[PDB]
Design a protein around this nucleic acid. Structure first.
Ligand SMILES: [Mn+2]
Ligand SMILES: [Mn+2]
Length: 178
DNA sequence: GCCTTGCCGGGTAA
DNA sequence: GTTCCGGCGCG
DNA sequence: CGCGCCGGAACTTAC
DNA sequence: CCGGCAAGGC
């Protein structure tokens, strides 16, 4: 719906700056976690949390949105087997995202781990396969780009968006909210 | 003269 | 970013 | 007994 | 994520 757009953006945040955790505790206890971390308390509570809350209402998830305070970051957390598989299944089908979903996800991923000086347009990730997919999406949207290994210390790849296509990128991806 | 982008080390924000 | 812990609830 | 939500926070590193 | 540097090209 418009639910798929919000979902693809949240998944961008999750993959970029959080995670999907399937945990096993003694014993045989368990937990399923949807997590976004971020430094800014305002960003988490006033922009990210209400979008998550909208999604929770839509899916009739009964879990609550937890915000947990670490010293270097705020952790938004939903403890929910259901929300978990929802995103986990959405991730494994990522190659089939429609255009509204691609744009939302790239935006979400850029909010998490894009170059925010905008002097340059770059996305960092260890996951080469994920970048190659975002690369294909950008090329279809008329945004030229390149991928290479940027940091040999942690195996981090960078996707570099050609500043030639700067204006089309900032308007189609960053400045579109649907 | 200037824009672009690969390189790579510091350390904040994951 | 990831994975411990102790807690509790529930059929 | 087995399993899933809560509330941390220590622990680790990818941006 | 940031940001200084340096090499290629218009
Ligand atoms: Mn990341
Ligand atoms: Mn981030």
């Amino acid at each position: 719906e418009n639910v798929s757009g919000i979902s693809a953006y949240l998944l961008g945040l999750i993959i970029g700056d959080g995670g999907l955790y399937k945990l096993k505790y003694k014993g045989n206890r368990s937990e399923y976690r949807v997590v976004i971390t971020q430094k800014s308390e305002n960003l988490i509570k006033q922009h990210i949390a209400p979008l998550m809350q909208f999604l929770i209402d839509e899916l009739n998830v009964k879990s609550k949105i937890q915000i947990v305070k670490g010293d270097t970051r705020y952790e938004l957390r939903v403890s929910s087997k259901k929300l978990y598989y929802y995103f986990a299944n959405m991730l494994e089908r990522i190659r089939l995202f429609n255009m509204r979903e691609q744009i939302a996800f790239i935006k979400g991923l850029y909010v998490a781990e894009g170059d925010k000086t905008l002097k340059r347009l770059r996305i960092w990730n260890k996951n080469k396969a994920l970048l190659e997919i975002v690369s294909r999406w950008l090329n279809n949207l008329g945004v030229r780009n390149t991928i290479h290994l940027d940091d040999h210390r942690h195996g981090v790849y960078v996707l570099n968006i050609s500043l030639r296509d700067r204006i089309k990128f900032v308007h189609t991806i960053l400045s579109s909210h649907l």
